[PDB]
Scaffold this active site. Structure first.
Site, PDB file in Angstrom:
ATOM      1  N   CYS B 108       0.645 -32.678 100.605  1.00 39.71           N
ATOM      2  CA  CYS B 108      -0.453 -33.328  99.902  1.00 39.71           C
ATOM      3  C   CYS B 108      -1.822 -33.047 100.506  1.00 39.71           C
ATOM      4  O   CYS B 108      -2.095 -33.383 101.672  1.00 39.71           O
ATOM      5  CB  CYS B 108      -0.226 -34.843  99.847  1.00 39.71           C
ATOM      6  SG  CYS B 108      -1.510 -35.725  98.909  1.00 39.71           S
ATOM      7  N   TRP B 280      -5.133 -38.866  91.485  1.00 42.37           N
ATOM      8  CA  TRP B 280      -5.933 -38.210  90.445  1.00 42.37           C
ATOM      9  C   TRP B 280      -5.740 -36.704  90.654  1.00 42.37           C
ATOM     10  O   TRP B 280      -5.361 -36.250  91.731  1.00 42.37           O
ATOM     11  CB  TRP B 280      -7.418 -38.602  90.521  1.00 42.37           C
ATOM     12  CG  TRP B 280      -8.041 -38.481  91.862  1.00 42.37           C
ATOM     13  CD1 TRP B 280      -8.527 -37.343  92.453  1.00 42.37           C
ATOM     14  CD2 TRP B 280      -8.291 -39.549  92.783  1.00 42.37           C
ATOM     15  NE1 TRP B 280      -9.068 -37.644  93.682  1.00 42.37           N
ATOM     16  CE2 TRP B 280      -8.937 -38.990  93.907  1.00 42.37           C
ATOM     17  CE3 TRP B 280      -8.038 -40.926  92.766  1.00 42.37           C
ATOM     18  CZ2 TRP B 280      -9.335 -39.763  95.002  1.00 42.37           C
ATOM     19  CZ3 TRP B 280      -8.433 -41.694  93.853  1.00 42.37           C
ATOM     20  CH2 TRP B 280      -9.076 -41.108  94.956  1.00 42.37           C
ATOM     21  N   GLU B 285      -4.201 -27.882  89.370  1.00 47.35           N
ATOM     22  CA  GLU B 285      -2.839 -28.285  89.039  1.00 47.35           C
ATOM     23  C   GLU B 285      -2.607 -28.074  87.543  1.00 47.35           C
ATOM     24  O   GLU B 285      -1.534 -27.636  87.115  1.00 47.35           O
ATOM     25  CB  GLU B 285      -2.591 -29.754  89.379  1.00 47.35           C
ATOM     26  CG  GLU B 285      -2.711 -30.087  90.872  1.00 47.35           C
ATOM     27  CD  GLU B 285      -2.454 -31.552  91.121  1.00 47.35           C
ATOM     28  OE1 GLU B 285      -1.264 -31.922  91.095  1.00 47.35           O
ATOM     29  OE2 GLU B 285      -3.433 -32.321  91.324  1.00 47.35           O
TER      30      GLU B 285
HETATM   31  C1  HEM Z   1      -5.789 -39.379  95.462  1.00 44.46           C
HETATM   32  C2  HEM Z   1      -5.252 -38.386  94.734  1.00 44.46           C
HETATM   33  C3  HEM Z   1      -4.438 -37.400  95.243  1.00 44.46           C
HETATM   34  C4  HEM Z   1      -4.733 -36.070  95.234  1.00 44.46           C
HETATM   35  C5  HEM Z   1      -6.026 -35.356  94.815  1.00 44.46           C
HETATM   36  C6  HEM Z   1      -3.527 -35.412  95.678  1.00 44.46           C
HETATM   37  C7  HEM Z   1      -3.321 -33.999  95.558  1.00 44.46           C
HETATM   38  C8  HEM Z   1      -2.067 -33.352  95.679  1.00 44.46           C
HETATM   39  C9  HEM Z   1      -1.794 -31.997  95.256  1.00 44.46           C
HETATM   40  C10 HEM Z   1      -2.768 -31.051  94.587  1.00 44.46           C
HETATM   41  C11 HEM Z   1      -0.496 -31.784  95.506  1.00 44.46           C
HETATM   42  C12 HEM Z   1       0.366 -30.611  95.028  1.00 44.46           C
HETATM   43  C13 HEM Z   1       1.003 -30.993  93.700  1.00 44.46           C
HETATM   44  C14 HEM Z   1       1.767 -29.835  93.067  1.00 44.46           C
HETATM   45  O1  HEM Z   1       1.480 -28.658  93.385  1.00 44.46           O
HETATM   46  O2  HEM Z   1       2.645 -30.109  92.236  1.00 44.46           O
HETATM   47  C15 HEM Z   1       0.051 -33.015  96.050  1.00 44.46           C
HETATM   48  C16 HEM Z   1       1.388 -33.178  96.521  1.00 44.46           C
HETATM   49  C17 HEM Z   1       1.950 -34.329  97.082  1.00 44.46           C
HETATM   50  N1  HEM Z   1       1.279 -35.530  97.209  1.00 44.46           N
HETATM   51 FE1  HEM Z   1      -0.699 -35.913  96.677  1.00 44.46          FE
HETATM   52  N2  HEM Z   1      -2.551 -36.335  95.979  1.00 44.46           N
HETATM   53  C18 HEM Z   1      -3.065 -37.555  95.729  1.00 44.46           C
HETATM   54  C19 HEM Z   1      -2.381 -38.763  95.880  1.00 44.46           C
HETATM   55  C20 HEM Z   1      -1.105 -38.960  96.388  1.00 44.46           C
HETATM   56  C21 HEM Z   1      -0.470 -40.258  96.592  1.00 44.46           C
HETATM   57  C22 HEM Z   1      -0.978 -41.607  96.057  1.00 44.46           C
HETATM   58  C23 HEM Z   1       0.667 -39.992  97.278  1.00 44.46           C
HETATM   59  C24 HEM Z   1       1.635 -40.894  97.790  1.00 44.46           C
HETATM   60  C25 HEM Z   1       1.521 -42.252  97.776  1.00 44.46           C
HETATM   61  C26 HEM Z   1       0.781 -38.535  97.369  1.00 44.46           C
HETATM   62  C27 HEM Z   1       1.916 -37.824  97.868  1.00 44.46           C
HETATM   63  C28 HEM Z   1       2.182 -36.431  97.715  1.00 44.46           C
HETATM   64  C29 HEM Z   1       3.459 -35.808  97.938  1.00 44.46           C
HETATM   65  C30 HEM Z   1       4.667 -36.498  98.600  1.00 44.46           C
HETATM   66  C31 HEM Z   1       3.341 -34.496  97.483  1.00 44.46           C
HETATM   67  C32 HEM Z   1       4.440 -33.435  97.311  1.00 44.46           C
HETATM   68  C33 HEM Z   1       5.044 -33.593  95.913  1.00 44.46           C
HETATM   69  C34 HEM Z   1       6.111 -32.559  95.606  1.00 44.46           C
HETATM   70  O3  HEM Z   1       6.790 -32.113  96.557  1.00 44.46           O
HETATM   71  O4  HEM Z   1       6.269 -32.209  94.408  1.00 44.46           O
HETATM   72  N3  HEM Z   1      -0.295 -37.931  96.810  1.00 44.46           N
HETATM   73  N4  HEM Z   1      -0.937 -33.961  96.107  1.00 44.46           N
HETATM   74  N1  LIG Z   2      -2.832 -34.957  92.344  1.00 43.81           N
HETATM   75  C1  LIG Z   2      -1.628 -35.441  92.120  1.00 43.81           C
HETATM   76  N2  LIG Z   2      -1.379 -36.733  92.370  1.00 43.81           N
HETATM   77  N3  LIG Z   2      -0.675 -34.623  91.645  1.00 43.81           N
HETATM   78  C2  LIG Z   2       0.717 -35.007  91.338  1.00 43.81           C
HETATM   79  C3  LIG Z   2       1.509 -33.799  90.851  1.00 43.81           C
HETATM   80  C4  LIG Z   2       1.008 -33.378  89.456  1.00 43.81           C
HETATM   81  C5  LIG Z   2       1.544 -32.021  88.962  1.00 43.81           C
HETATM   82  N4  LIG Z   2       1.192 -30.909  89.902  1.00 43.81           N
HETATM   83  C6  LIG Z   2       0.967 -31.719  87.580  1.00 43.81           C
HETATM   84  O1  LIG Z   2       0.270 -30.710  87.440  1.00 43.81           O
HETATM   85  O2  LIG Z   2       1.226 -32.500  86.644  1.00 43.81           O
END
Ligand code: HEM
Ligand SMILES: NC(=[NH2+])NCCC[C@H](N)C(=O)O
Ligand code: HEM
Ligand SMILES: C[C@H](O)[C@H](O)[C@H]1CNc2nc(N)[nH]c(=O)c2N1
Ligand SMILES: C[C@H](O)[C@H](O)[C@H]1CNc2nc(N)[nH]c(=O)c2N1
Ligand SMILES: NC(=[NH2+])NCCC[C@H](N)C(=O)O
Ligand SMILES: [Zn+2]
Lengths: 407, 411
Positions: B108, B280, B285
């Site tokens: 993340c 958000w 993405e």
């Molecule tokens: C505030 C907004 C957030 C942004 C901008 C953000 C952004 C991202 C991005 C761009 C990725 C890659 C997603 C993908 O390629 O499918 C990601 C992955 C991840 N994020 Fe965030 N995130 C946010 C909030 C959160 C929150 C609220 C949590 C947990 C409470 C979280 C947990 C994770 C996890 C565990 C992954 C890996 C998911 C997977 O393996 O498919 N994120 N995030």
């Molecule tokens: N910024 C996030 N919370 N991303 C959650 C995963 C969303 C996913 N990569 C999509 O394009 O739908």
């Protein structure tokens, strides 16, 4: 034991058995992955030699033959006696090709078996090295129809008689620190550019000054040499639409030739082994031209394009990055200088991986390096799982000589 | 043992000691790196130690390590485990746990916001209708009319593994995918299998290109039930381009709230199999992956044509040119509609600051380079040049198999 890698775009699954022959370490452990880290005696020698000869004879379908046992014995005797050995020409060529075949960070390995190998093991002086290098450059440049090649100088002995090419690449542009504090030319070479001077080079202090070779032979101090300008193919960078582009005053050299690595074959170390191929567009257009620590030219181009550079979300950097890269490819192609775009190169690499998996049981690959620096996921390698491991013969990193040399 | 990471663009070198507290495995070995591989019931015997490590971390965080309260809690949990084979987290511990699972999520890039997570405790939930109600509330709260707020809703933990709570959807909001007899796919190809399951369960599919899927919710190990999210609760953004007026005519749109709902949250040994969380979007993405992956909406060609690009040869970089435009359109549309979104430049810059801060105040920041670097313009973002160490810390978010592969249907 048997590991599988999946391509998430095609669902194709390949099984890797080749990693089972891995000999060196990766930097990782079951607790930590260091995959993004750039740089993670007679008794020692014989096993390495044996491992190699075994590979070699197996490759020529004479595994366990008299010829095999014989050679094995001869090298063994030679090692016990000389404390080292010399490869047959056949082994040298095989080793060099396979070192390229095993280079996990190289996306152009589909051409591995076509490498031209120049045996410079008979070289003894810096002028001699300059001669071999000039011949390599002319051969590989081939008027723009680039041909891959490697020149192999004498192997290491006692470490006090090592051959080394001090340049990081045979052909590169100088870098000088100005009063302004800013940097003139290529910042990556600012230092080396100073060591030449510290040696007598008369720097023209320009933006794209082809640097001089600094060659070290048999351990002696290194000497300078200006590569015949007639042998250095350059490409003036223009855009197929933006005539103001030419005004940027940009140009790059056509021959990419890494010269600071160390080639290991059967335990023997070749510390001076410059090799060249041809460019993939992004190396120049994305990295050399747009890295903030390189020519850092994004803004200037965005200005000329008159893009809204007020907010990052306008993606002006991205827009410009693309145009620039279109220009590099357009220019090289215009002058009939070999170059490959990242789409075509990555496509070839996927084909190569499949070939390798099918005919060798695998292909060590470093995803962090294989995926191009722009448009990552629109290239096929982004969606390709890869296993990185170290196989020998191999190309290894080695310390810059100016941090080890004893004048 | 100390480990240093270097940023080759700024030469800044950081030292990692946090990796020492890493217990879980990576998938790699001294002889092989599996860094680009996507996916490399407990016993009392294994539970209390996991609980203690957690409680120890929690009490240190509140500066009460060794306190009577700390010892009393360990004793209380110890007894409860031996007594009931499991234990219940205090509300404070749950919040701390959820926030840290996010803080520890190496893939993340948005973790600079980790401390502000809103945690909704749904551990008193007992039915699928109850789950739907909690989920509607989460979506409305998180959406906040476009001013997105990060949140997570935590349903009851696993017990015997036969009474799991699960959200079968992979995201709370996502578009249906339909395999046509001619071999083409209508809508989102990524959700075809799940869409089929929904239809089989009784969902009447409108068979369009952007149909919001129904929620398929499983409570207490029972068969899942379908529910339609109130349309008024689903915020969507019509995608248009600032300079190209024909872009809008592509008929593209996306939802504003990304809410992963298929992961497993582990805290102090406890397993929360239904823990939907939302933040958000980062523009890429949607713009790069959801729209341009060959296996997703795959719109690159159509956009390229409209732009009248030279599509005869890849070296014209027509794909790259069209990709940028599409991503400009996504960001522009969201911003115009005042729906939270962050571009990859801003997001990665923020992540670098967050990472540095973490190294200094925490001793490190596990990060997965492969996932952190954006899918476009990689090297013009700071993260590309940043070395990173990847290791697993708990609490954590983990993958789990799709429920339809493991569920014992009751009929
Ligand atoms: C505030 C907004 C957030 C942004 C901008 C953000 C952004 C991202 C991005 C761009 C990725 C890659 C997603 C993908 O390629 O499918 C990601 C992955 C991840 N994020 Fe965030 N995130 C946010 C909030 C959160 C929150 C609220 C949590 C947990 C409470 C979280 C947990 C994770 C996890 C565990 C992954 C890996 C998911 C997977 O393996 O498919 N994120 N995030
Ligand atoms: N910024 C996030 N919370 N991303 C959650 C995963 C969303 C996913 N990569 C999509 O394009 O739908
Ligand atoms: C013929 C065309 C060739 C192409 C298109 C190709 C392409 C590439 C690219 C794009 C990289 C990354 C460069 C960087 O980011 O700095 C690379 C790395 C590498 N290549 Fe090749 N290559 C070619 C020939 C060769 C040859 C002839 C050898 C050796 C015989 C070789 C060995 C390697 C090694 C060892 C690396 C990693 C170097 C490092 O760590 O800096 N390549 N190649
Ligand atoms: C820190 C990170 O490893 C570093 O920036 C790497 C990433 N991928 C790369 N990939 C290639 N081909 N060349 C490079 O120099 C790098 N640099
Ligand atoms: C095979 C490879 O691991 C895979 O395509 C990864 C690469 N990096 C990624 N990075 C992010 N953020 N999201 C992804 O889905 C992926 N997919
Ligand atoms: N394609 C090659 N052989 N590349 C060798 C490395 C060249 C280096 N990436 C550069 O841009 O100068
Ligand atoms: Zn690894």
């Amino acid at each position: 034991r048997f590991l599988k890698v999946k391509n998430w775009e095609t669902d194709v699954v390949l099984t890797d058995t080749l990693h089972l022959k891995s000999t060196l370490e990766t930097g990782c452990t079951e607790h930590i992955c260091m995959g993004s880290i750039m740089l993670p005696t007679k008794d020692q020698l014989f096993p390495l030699a044996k491992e190699f000869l075994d590979q070699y004879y197996s490759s020529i379908k004479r595994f366990g033959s008299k010829a095999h046992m014989d050679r094995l014995e001869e090298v063994n005797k030679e090692i016990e006696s000389t404390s080292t050995y010399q490869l047959k020409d056949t082994e040298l060529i095989y080793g060099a090709k396979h070192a390229w075949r095993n280079a996990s960070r190289c996306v152009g390995r589909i051409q591995w078996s076509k490498l031209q190998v120049f045996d410079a093991r008979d070289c003894t002086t810096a002028h001699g090295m300059f001669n071999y290098i000039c011949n390599h450059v002319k051969y590989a440049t081939n008027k723009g129809n680039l041909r891959s090649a490697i020149t192999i100088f004498p192997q290491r002995t006692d470490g006090k008689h090592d051959f080394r090419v001090w340049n990081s690449q045979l052909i590169r542009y100088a870098g000088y620190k100005q009063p302004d504090g800013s940097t003139l030319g290529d910042p990556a070479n600012v230092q080396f550019t100073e060591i030449c001077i510290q040696q007598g080079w008369k720097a023209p202090r320009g933006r794209f000054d082809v640097l001089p070779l600094l060659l070290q032979a048999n351990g002696n101090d290194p000497e300078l040499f200006q590569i015949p300008p007639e042998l250095v193919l350059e490409v003036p960078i223009r855009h197929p639409k933006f005539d103001w582009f030419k005004d940027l005053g940009l140009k790059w050299y056509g021959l990419p030739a890494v010269s600071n690595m160390l080639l290991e074959i059967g335990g023997l170390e070749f510390s001076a082994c410059p090799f060249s191929g041809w460019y993939m567009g992004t190396e120049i257009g994305v990295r050399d031209y747009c890295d903030n620590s390189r020519y850092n030219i994004l803004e200037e181009v965005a200005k000329k394009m008159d893009l809204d550079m007020r907010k990052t979300s306008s993606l002006w950097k991205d827009q410009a990055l693309v145009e620039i890269n279109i220009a590099v490819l357009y220019s090289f192609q215009s002058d009939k200088v070999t170059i490959v775009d990242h789409h075509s190169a990555t496509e070839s690499f996927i084909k190569h991986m499949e070939n390798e998996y099918r005919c060798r049981g695998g292909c060590p690959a470093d995803w962090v390096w294989i995926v191009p620096p722009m448009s990552g996921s629109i290239t096929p390698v982004f969606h390709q799982e890869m296993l990185n491991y170290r196989l020998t013969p191999s190309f290894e990193y080695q310390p810059d000589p100016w941090n080890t040399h004893v004048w």
